[PDB]
Amino acid sequence: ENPASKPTPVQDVQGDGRWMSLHHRFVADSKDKEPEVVFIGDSLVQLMHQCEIWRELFSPLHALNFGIGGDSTQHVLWRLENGELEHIRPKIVVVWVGTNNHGHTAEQVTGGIKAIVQLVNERQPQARVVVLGLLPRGQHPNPLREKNRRVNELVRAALAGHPRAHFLDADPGFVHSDGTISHHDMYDYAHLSRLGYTPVCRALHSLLLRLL
Amino acid sequence: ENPASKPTPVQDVQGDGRWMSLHHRFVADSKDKEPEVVFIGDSLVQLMHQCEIWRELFSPLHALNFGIGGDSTQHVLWRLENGELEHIRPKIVVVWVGTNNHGHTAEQVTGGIKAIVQLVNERQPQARVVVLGLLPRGQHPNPLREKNRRVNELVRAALAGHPRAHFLDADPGFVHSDGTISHHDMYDYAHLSRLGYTPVCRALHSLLLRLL
Numbered sequence: 001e002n003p004a005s006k007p008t009p010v011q012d013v014q015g016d017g018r019w020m021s022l023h024h025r026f027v028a029d030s031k032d033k034e035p036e037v038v039f040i041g042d043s044l045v046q047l048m049h050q051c052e053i054w055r056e057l058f059s060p061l062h063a064l065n066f067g068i069g070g071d072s073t074q075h076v077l078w079r080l081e082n083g084e085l086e087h088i089r090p091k092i093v094v095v096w097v098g099t100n101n102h103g104h105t106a107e108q109v110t111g112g113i114k115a116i117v118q119l120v121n122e123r124q125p126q127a128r129v130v131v132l133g134l135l136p137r138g139q140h141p142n143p144l145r146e147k148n149r150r151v152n153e154l155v156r157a158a159l160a161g162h163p164r165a166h167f168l169d170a171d172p173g174f175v176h177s178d179g180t181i182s183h184h185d186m187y188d189y190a191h192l193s194r195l196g197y198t199p200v201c202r203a204l205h206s207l208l209l210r211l212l
Numbered sequence: 213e214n215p216a217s218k219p220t221p222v223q224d225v226q227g228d229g230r231w232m233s234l235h236h237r238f239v240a241d242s243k244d245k246e247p248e249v250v251f252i253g254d255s256l257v258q259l260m261h262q263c264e265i266w267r268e269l270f271s272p273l274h275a276l277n278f279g280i281g282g283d284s285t286q287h288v289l290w291r292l293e294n295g296e297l298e299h300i301r302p303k304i305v306v307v308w309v310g311t312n313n314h315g316h317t318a319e320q321v322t323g324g325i326k327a328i329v330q331l332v333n334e335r336q337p338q339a340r341v342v343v344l345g346l347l348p349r350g351q352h353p354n355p356l357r358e359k360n361r362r363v364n365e366l367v368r369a370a371l372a373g374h375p376r377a378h379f380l381d382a383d384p385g386f387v388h389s390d391g392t393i394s395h396h397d398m399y400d401y402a403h404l405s406r407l408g409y410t411p412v413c414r415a416l417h418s419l420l421l422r423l424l
Contacts, residue, residue, distance in 0.1 A: 018401045139233040189228065194262060
């Protein structure tokens, strides 16, 4: 099995059960709401809801944010299969996950992303799927840069043949000429600040409005 | 040895070196700036800098924020010993760390917190030290609630005999009568939202202004 596309919850090894509380909240959201767009993935999704203005660009679109810090692809897959696509009929599902798949090869993470697009195509066949490219990370050149770039090539070539699956690279050019990422964009060289969110989100908003 | 008070960097098992980039940035901050207050600890410290308005309450105070998501006590201890207290002479150092010490007993985390106050008293003997109580976490009652409460009793009783060491519980009462924490306060039942930061930070600002 590709471990990236084998659905599995995050096991609580800390004791406060917060991942499963998050999941149950999103399930109840889906039971009770009628979104047109659902956002799912890791803390880049999750933190957009606070840390960026989601209210001005995305709230009008009738959007649920189901981001969980730390999730890998298999975690998202599990969540989509275990209640978060129930009782809804979005027009669009936005997927942003894969940068936390540590210990998986790029091909494996790509296999994880392809399994999420497949699940969404089966459980919510009317929806378009948007997959965001994995962003660069690390202050200087490093192997996760090259990993996430390779994921992005492989995913883009996989989605090229899919009428209603869209690859979006939302990277404005966070890697500079000197090879560096600025902490003004990414305060810890991976998570975006308000400034790093702005151009990402407006690339996303523009794609969403054409589609919608 | 108490593992909580044995200084040690976070080892990079991912490959992009971001923890050590963060540390080097803070070292350069300390070389080049002249803060009156330095904030150090985990992502509750770190995210206050974006996620709350640090600008209105804390920026006037000439404050550096040296928070790193995921740090335990021994990580903070290492950082304070390995350059982040160099070239400065703060009036106040604010410590908020211990909630990530998974696998350490409450007594051990307390031993970690006491070693950080001791380091700061030796390297920056003029500064007052403020230690923030560990906040509750988890949506419902769970063993990390009781752990962090016990840490807070033990730390408060340790700092009671210290003229210029101050324990501050900044918890407004995030645990409700029904036993629950609201996701309006803590979006993932551990990290604060803008709303959860407001009362925390104004408790902190008030203590700082008396002292200062």
